[PDB]
Structure formats: structure tokens, C-alpha cells
Amino acid sequence: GSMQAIKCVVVGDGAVGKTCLLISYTTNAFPGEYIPTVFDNYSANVMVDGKPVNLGLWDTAGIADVFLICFSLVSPASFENVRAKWYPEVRHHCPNTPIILVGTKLDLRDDKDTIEKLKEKKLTPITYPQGLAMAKEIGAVKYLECSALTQRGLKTVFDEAIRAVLCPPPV
Ligand SMILES: Nc1nc2c(ncn2[C@@H]2O[C@H](COP(=O)(O)OP(=O)(O)NP(=O)(O)O)[C@@H](O)[C@H]2O)c(=O)[nH]1
Ligand SMILES: [Mg+2]
């Protein structure tokens, strides 16, 4: 053993939950404490489809094998920036590198008070069909929703980032 190294770079607007996504996945605990930019990258040794992989995860302020573009499901402004900023920025460096679109803070999309404070701003959470359509719009290989807090959807984000590298499409 013998494992494949895969580099994954995580981008998206400020406060969408990139750091908490990576820490929750790699330590299995949502961080209830301050996180100094001491760490800009995290690591996980994972088995996907019977294949041992060293997943290297690179965090940013909001050569990759795969990118995660993240937006908060309760921030329409972060969602618009997926196509306005993050997709063009990734594609200038890397025309072909797969992208996974990730909607974060899934626990808040059905949260009553987060729905109610948005409604004061004539905003509403991003729905699953809207996210899926934005993924098609930016040519993302997959669209996934997750909560770092509850860990719902969290493992699948990384499993899919890995499958995107290990199993590229025909062509
Ligand atoms: N309810 C909920 N809050 C979350 C979740 N993930 C992160 N948060 C909260 O969202 C805020 C931002 O999280 P953080 O991971 O620091 O975001 P970031 O994208 O790294 N920010 P930056 O780009 O500035 O470094 C924090 O208050 C954090 O607790 C989640 O899944 N659910
Ligand atoms: Mg951060």
C-alpha cells in the first residue's frame, strides 16, 4: 500500500463554510473553536470503490486534480458568484479539471429562522433544482449538498471528488 495521491482545491465566497467543511470531514468533528490560518491544507486517507487514496485538500480565502466550488444554500449572493467569479477563475488556470459544485449549510435550508431573516431581505434559500441547473451552467461533473455541522451529505462530496479523478468521462 500503495495509494494514489489526489489534490483537491476548495474555493468559494467568504463565510460559505469551506474551512468547517474540510475540518469536519477530516477530523470528523465540526469545529466549535477558532481555527488559525495555521492550516491551509488538510488530508484524508480514504477508500473509494475499493481503491486507497490520499486526498489532499487545499483551503482558500474567499495543480489541482479536482476543484470544489462552494456556495452557501442560504446565501443567494454566494450562489451567483459561482458563475460570476469562481467558475471563470478556475477555468482560466485549468480548462479541463473537473469541478464539483457544493451547496453548504444544508441544515439551514429548512431552518425556520434562516428562512424568516432571508424573507425580511426578499431572499429565499437555493433549492436543489436551482443548484443542479447552476451545475449544468458551469459544466460541473456533479452537484452535491451538505452540512458540515450535521455531516449530512459530507462524505459523498469527497467520494465524488475522488471518483471524478479516478473515472473521467468517455472522450
Ligand atoms: N449552520 C451551519 N453553520 C456552518 C456550517 N459550516 C460552517 N458554518 C458556519 O459558517 C461560518 C463560516 O464558516 P467557515 O468555515 O469559517 O467559512 P469559510 O468559507 O472558511 N470563510 P473564509 O472564506 O473567510 O475563510 C462559521 O460561523 C461557521 O460556524 C454548516 O454546515 N452549518
Ligand atoms: Mg476559511
From the list 162, 128, 143, 171, the residue with the least C-alpha distance to 50 is: 162
H-helix or E-strand containing 79?
A: helix 76-81
Pocket residue to mutate for ligand 1, from 19, 24, 35, 110, most atoms within 8 A of Cβ = 19
Pocket of ligand 1 (CB under 6 A): 14-20, 61-62, 104-105, 107-108, 147-149
Instruction: Report CA Rg, the chain.
Output: 16
Instruction: Tell whether residue 149 is among the known ligand binding residues.
Output: yes
Q: How far apart are CA 118 and CA 103, in angstroms?
A: 17
List the domain boundaries for the chain: 1-171
Question: Atom 7, ligand 1: which residue's CA is nearest?
Answer: 17
Q: Give the technique used to solve this structure.
A: X-ray
Q: Which ligand is nearest to the CA of 23?
A: 1
**Count of residues making up the chain:** 171
Cβ 143 vs Cβ 106: under 8 Å? no
Q: How far apart are CA 144 and CA 156, in angstroms?
A: 8
Question: Atom 15, ligand 1: which residue's CA is nearest?
Answer: 17
C-alpha cell at 26: 477530516
Question: Atom 28, ligand 1: which residue's CA is nearest?
Answer: 17
Q: How far apart are CA 103 and CA 71, in angstroms?
A: 5
Distances, alpha carbon 82 to alpha carbons 15, 28, 71, 139, in Å: 14, 27, 7, 11
Sheet containing strand 41-48, strands side by side: 41-48, 51-58, 4-12, 66-72, 99-104, 142-145
Q: How far apart are CA 85 and CA 50, in angstroms?
A: 36
The resolution in Å comes to 1.8
Cβ 135 vs Cβ 69: under 8 Å? no
3-state SS, one letter per residue, for 126-169: CCHHHHHHHHHHHCCCEEEECCCCCCCCHHHHHHHHHHHHHCCC
Beta bridge partners of 143: 101
Question: Atom 25, ligand 1: which residue's CA is nearest?
Answer: 61
The class that CATH gives domain 1-171 is alpha beta
